[PDB]
Amino acid sequence: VSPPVLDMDGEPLKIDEEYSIISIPFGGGSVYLANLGNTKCPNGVVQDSSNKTPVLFYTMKLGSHFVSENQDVSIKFSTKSCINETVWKVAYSIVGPTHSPLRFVITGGTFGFPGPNNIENWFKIEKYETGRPHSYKLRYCPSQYICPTCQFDCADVGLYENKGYARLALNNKPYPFGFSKVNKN
Ligand SMILES: [Cl-]
Ligand SMILES: [Cl-]
Ligand SMILES: [Cl-]
């Protein structure tokens, strides 16, 4: 049984509530939404190395209010033409001097219930030891049932400098984050 992901106050991460994703504990800033190449709507999921755009987590699972470790979760940046351009997903690009494929985290997912049609939407949060409480890593490894014929190339989420930004990327080099609740009530 997997316990809930906890925010930096030690409180379980609740679905559909705003949290900022913060680089901890060794420096760096927040995750935010950036425009990478004068596109109509910004689609870059980036880290401010040293800007903040909170996120909302969704599992659409009756009986589970919280995001648990290793639970499939869909992620949106919080907020007029760009209202449907906030849903996180993963997508291949070709990068670097070796022109090698790398999957970046970007917006432009179509929010939905999990299935073969939207494999790109699904993330996991795992505990990641740093010596500081409440540090985690993001990960791409969707539950097999979401696409039974998929053989996923699972990878932890890290950062890769590209297009002038520290971009969230499936480079399998975990970058530790914590979750800071925006509205404590
Ligand atoms: Cl939900
Ligand atoms: Cl419920
Ligand atoms: Cl792709």
Write up this protein.
- The protein has 185 residues and is mainly beta.
- It has one domain: Trefoil (Acidic Fibroblast Growth Factor, subunit A) (Trefoil).
- The protein has no helices and 13 strands.
- A 4-stranded antiparallel sheet has the order 2-3-12-11, with no helix packed on it. A 3-stranded antiparallel sheet has the order 8-9-10, with no helix packed on it. The protein has a two-stranded antiparallel ribbon with strand order 1-13.
- Strand 11 and strand 12 form a beta hairpin.
- The protein is globular and about 45 Å long.
- The protein binds chloride ion (3 copies).
Summarize the structure.
The protein is mostly beta strands and 185 residues long. The chain has strands spanning 19-23, 31-34, 44-47, 55-58, 74-77, 88-95, 100-107, 124-127, 136-140, 155-156, 158-162, 165-169, 177-181. It has one domain (1-185): Trefoil (Trefoil (Acidic Fibroblast Growth Factor, subunit A)), CATH 2.80.10.50.
Topology (SSEs and partners):
Blueprint lengths: L18 E5 L7 E4 L9 E4 L7 E4 L15 E4 L10 E8 L4 E8 L16 E4 L8 E5 L14 E2 L1 E5 L2 E5 L7 E5 L4
Antiparallel strand pairs: 1-13, 2-3, 3-12, 4-5, 6-7, 8-9, 9-10, 11-12
The structure holds chloride ion (3 copies).
The domain count comes to: 1
| Rg, Å, rounded | 16 Å
CATH topology: Trefoil (Acidic Fibroblast Growth Factor, subunit A)
Question: How far is it from the N-terminal to the C-terminal residue, by CA?
Answer: 29 Å
Assigned CATH architecture: Trefoil
Order of helices and strands: EEEEEEEEEEEEE
What count of helical segments does DSSP give? 0
Helix content: under 10%
CATH class: Mainly Beta
Strand content: 25-35%
Helix/strand class: mainly beta
Number of strands: 13
Shape: globular
Q: Give a list of the ligands.
A: chloride ion
Strand order of the largest sheet: 2-3-12-11
Largest β sheet strand count, sense and barrel closure? 4 strands, antiparallel
PDB class: protease inhibitor
Keywords: Plant Kunitz-family inhibitor, protease inhibitor
Assembly: monomeric
Entry title: Structure of the Kunitz-type cysteine protease inhibitor PCPI-3 from potato
